[PDB]
Structures are given as structure tokens and as C-alpha cells.
Swiss-Prot record:
Entry keywords, A to Z: Acetylation, Cytoplasm, Disease variant, GTPase activation, Isopeptide bond, Phosphoprotein, Ubl conjugation
Subcellular location: Cytoplasm
Modification sites for N6-acetyllysine: K40, K62, A76, K113
Protein name: Rho GDP-dissociation inhibitor 1
Assigned protein family: Belongs to the Rho GDI family.
Glycyl lysine isopeptide (Lys-Gly) (interchain with G-Cter in SUMO2) crosslink site(s): A73, A76
Oligomer status and interactors: Monomer. Interacts with FER. Interacts with PLXNB3. Forms a heterodimer with RAC1. Interacts with RHOA, the affinity is increased by three orders of magnitude when RHOA is prenylated. Interacts with PSMD10; the interaction increases ARHGDIA association with RHOA, leading to ARHGDIA-mediated inactivation of RHOA and ROCK and prolonged AKT activation. Interacts with KANK2; the interaction is direct and may regulate the interaction of ARHGDIA with RHOA, RAC1 and CDC42. Interacts with RHOC. Interacts with CDC42. Interacts with NGFR (via death domain); NGFR binding decreases the affinity for RHOA.
Covalent cross-link site, Glycyl lysine isopeptide (Lys-Gly) (interchain with G-Cter in SUMO1): A73, A76
Disorder named in the UniProt entry: Nephrotic syndrome 8: A form of nephrotic syndrome, a renal disease clinically characterized by progressive renal failure, severe proteinuria, hypoalbuminemia, hyperlipidemia and edema. Kidney biopsies show diffuse mesangial sclerosis, with small glomeruli, hypercellularity, increased extracellular matrix, and contracted/collapsed glomerular tufts surrounded by immature or abnormal podocytes.
Length: 138
């Protein structure tokens, strides 16, 4: 049977972004490693993680995210998702509002290691993507 939990996507929710910033997590995750979303410095945003539970209840689901700059971790955050049972409709998790960095010295590439797990520490899905902070959506 298809995994009990299927992570289906990640969306960088930003009201002022010119276009959609989302990753399809149901396909090939390798392509993301060479790609990067552009985010204007200082803008507020959230991260929407779409997923579905197919058969059994899952408890303590957490969306983990480590952010690196110049190859070194500058932040680690565990987002308590919750315990949710099976449902036909796809679930969506929104992290609290975040604020992007500002100032020259904050600009540049940022790499993210993302993981969706639960209590049993199950690796429901892990993936790496990139971000680039710019003065404007340039």
C-alpha cells in the first residue's frame, strides 16, 4: 500500500511575491537542489506544507527545517504539526508568520534541509531546496 503519509508539496506563502513559489514534492526532488526561490529581503511569509494521511492516525507530526548559509547551519526549527487521522482531503500546515532578513549582509543564497516526521521519528519525506534573498524581487 501507498505510504500512510504522503507529503505532496511545499509553498512559500508571500502576499507580495510576483509569482507562485512552490515545490511539487510528489516527483523528483533532485531538481530542487539546483534551483532557488527568490525572496525580497524583509518580506513576511509562511511555509505551507501539503500532505495526506491515507490509513492510520499519525501523532506528533513535525515539520523540521534547518537553514544553512555558506554551508553552515544558521538556524534549526521544529514546527509542531499535530496528530491527525486519515482523511480523503489533503491537509495543509501553515507555519507562523516569518520575516525575511534585511540588509546587504543578509542577502545571498540560503539552503534548506526539510523533513516531515512524527513521534515514531518516521522519515515521511525529506528534501533540500534553496532560497535567495535580494534587495528587491529584482
Amino acid at each position: 500500500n501507498v505510504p500512510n503519509v504522503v507529503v505532496t508539496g511545499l509553498t512559500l506563502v508571500c502576499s507580495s511575491a510576483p509569482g507562485p513559489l512552490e515545490l511539487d514534492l510528489t516527483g523528483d526532488l533532485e531538481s530542487f537542489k539546483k534551483q532557488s526561490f527568490v525572496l525580497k529581503e524583509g518580506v513576511e511569509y509562511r511555509i505551507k506544507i501539503s500532505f495526506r494521511v491515507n490509513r492510520e492516525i499519525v501523532s506528533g507530526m513535525k515539520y523540521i527545517q534547518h537553514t544553512y548559509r555558506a554551508g553552515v547551519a544558521i538556524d534549526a526549527t521544529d514546527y509542531m504539526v499535530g496528530s491527525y487521522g486519515p482523511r480523503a482531503e489533503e491537509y495543509e500546515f501553515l507555519t507562523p508568520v516569518e520575516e525575511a532578513p534585511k540588509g546587504m549582509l543578509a542577502r545571498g543564497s540560503y539552503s534548506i534541509k526539510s523533513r516531515f516526521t512524527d513521534d515514531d521519528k518516521t522519515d515521511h519525506l525529506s528534501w533540500e531546496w534553496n532560497l535567495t534573498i535580494k534587495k528587491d524581487w529584482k
